Ligand binder design. Sequence first.
Ligand SMILES: CCCCc1n[nH]c2oc(=O)c3ccccc3c12
Length: 110
Amino acid sequence: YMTPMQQKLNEVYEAVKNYTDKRGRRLSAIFLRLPSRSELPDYYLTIKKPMDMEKIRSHMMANKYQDIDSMVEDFVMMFNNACTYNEPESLIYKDALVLHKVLLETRRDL
Ligand SMILES: CCCCc1n[nH]c2oc(=O)c3ccccc3c12
């Protein structure tokens, strides 16, 4: 679609968005948009800096990322948030770990 760095940003975003496991489950589904404060109040009690993929996507679509590693840092904050709020035995916790590996593998390639 356009410039090298915009393309790299898009590739990072899409890799995490589109990832599917062996059963065809899209792990990013629950991460697109945070519920409201009344819907998930314990998250907002626990997490200093709320983050979801729609937030990252908006920032990206408005050309506000000046490098790739800023975008990577926002995803890492998202997954760190998930693994701070949720217990290790939860599925969302395990999904966050997987997608954090997906993110880094993508970044490693450029
Ligand atoms: C039952 C809905 C649970 C949604 C949810 N639980 N824990 C989460 O941690 C997150 O970091 C996160 C990020 C974006 C959207 C949802 C969640 C989330």
